[PDB]
Design a protein around this ligand. Structure first.
Ligand SMILES: O=C(O)CNC(=O)C(=O)O
Ligand SMILES: [Mg+2]
Ligand code: NI
Ligand SMILES: [Zn+2]
Length: 331
């Protein structure tokens, strides 16, 4: 078995290997990459996402989210308070202000220490989940707006044609902006490209050990667990590496820098934080190997998770027994 310790693997495809996206994902899996839940892909030196980032300031962040924490430093939830709209230029200025800017630090490890010590005492503002793309239309390789759609994959594998669409999302971050522990909708893959700015630190639990994280989460968030049998789908709970280690949960960590891709694999729980002002683009995707994960994915039916239009068909076709309860949660 390849990669039996479930380490995060880093790949350096050549320009020729960067042509065929599906083929390269299957290659990475042949080397055991998926066992970690997360892989890094460094593009060939010849590649670029677009020519420059000099003209992005007028993008609108219609609903910036202030991420307010509750709990203790290593075990907390966050809720998202909606703020007034602002442009990317306005948000960048805000991220760089004395109130929000990255503190002085020695290296990524020192910054990570500072994050976990101090995150809860601040409420950073995240421009998350903005439909759109920063890839140039002429970028033919690993262009996250030109991937094969999940609806087409389901139709290719299973023969059933379904409604729905699959488009990317932009994320504008600042210091301490946080992504809570989660797997993707329907335990899909994700791919995330860090277009510009400061790094993003990731934590990940191997898919084969995801239920260990779920059992810890139920212990640490016991009211939430009584409320919903899949409350990590709410995407609000944080648990620090120190607490994971104290409880014997297998995990790994890595820092993504600008110009790098990360892929999360089906049922790979992940969480993390941004180091300073940045912009990422991410989208969900599927492969043949996903289908079995999609059929077994947990679902939130309590009403909290509320998701896209296109998840309806995935539940309806892959999980018909669960469909009626899940759809009630959507309505
Ligand atoms: O970058 C973020 O805030 C969150 N991203 C992801 O969870 C992802 O790409 O799957
Ligand atoms: Mg602009
Ligand atoms: Ni994710
Ligand atoms: Zn729920």
């Amino acid at each position: 078995a390849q990669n039996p310790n479930c380490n995060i693997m880093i790949f350096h495809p050549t320009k020729e290997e960067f042509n065929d996206f599906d083929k390269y994902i299957a290659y990475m899996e042949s080397q055991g990459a998926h066992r970690a839940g997360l892989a890094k892909i460094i593009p060939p030196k010849e590649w670029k996402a677009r020519e420059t980032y000099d003209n992005i300031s007028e993008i609108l962040i219609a609903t910036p989210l202030q991420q307010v924490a509750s709990g203790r430093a290593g075990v907390f939830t966050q809720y998202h308070k909606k703020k007034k709209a602002m442009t990317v230029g306005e948000y960048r200025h805000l991220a760089n202000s004395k109130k929000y800017q990255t503190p002085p630090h020695q290296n990524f490890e020192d910054l990570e220490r500072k994050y976990w010590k101090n995150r809860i005492y601040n409420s950073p503002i995240y421009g998350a989940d903005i439909s759109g793309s920063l890839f140039d239309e002429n970028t033919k390789q690993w262009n996250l707006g030109h991937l094969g759609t999940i609806q087409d994959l389901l139709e290719k594998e299973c023969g059933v044609v379904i409604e729905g669409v699959n488009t990317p999302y932009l994320y504008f971050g600042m210091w301490k902006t946080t992504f809570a522990w989660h797997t993707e909708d329907m335990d899909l893959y994700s791919i995330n490209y860090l277009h510009l700015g400061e790094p993003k630190t990731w934590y990940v639990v191997p898919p084969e050990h995801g239920q260990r994280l779920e059992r810890l989460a139920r212990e640490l968030f016991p009211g939430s667990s009584r409320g919903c049998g899949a409350f990590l789908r709410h995407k609000v709970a944080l648990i620090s590496p120190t607490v994971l280690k104290e409880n014997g949960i297998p995990f790994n960590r890595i820092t993504q820098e600008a110009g790098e891709f990360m892929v999360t694999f089906p049922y790979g729980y992940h969480a993390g934080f941004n180091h300073g002002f940045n912009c990422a683009e991410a989208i969900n995707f599927a492969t043949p190997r996903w289908i079995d994960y999609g059929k077994m994915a947990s679902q939130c039916s309590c009403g909290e998770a509320r998701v896209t239009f296109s998840m309806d068909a995935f539940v309806r076709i892959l999980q018909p027994e669960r469909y009626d309860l899940w759809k009630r949660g959507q309505d």
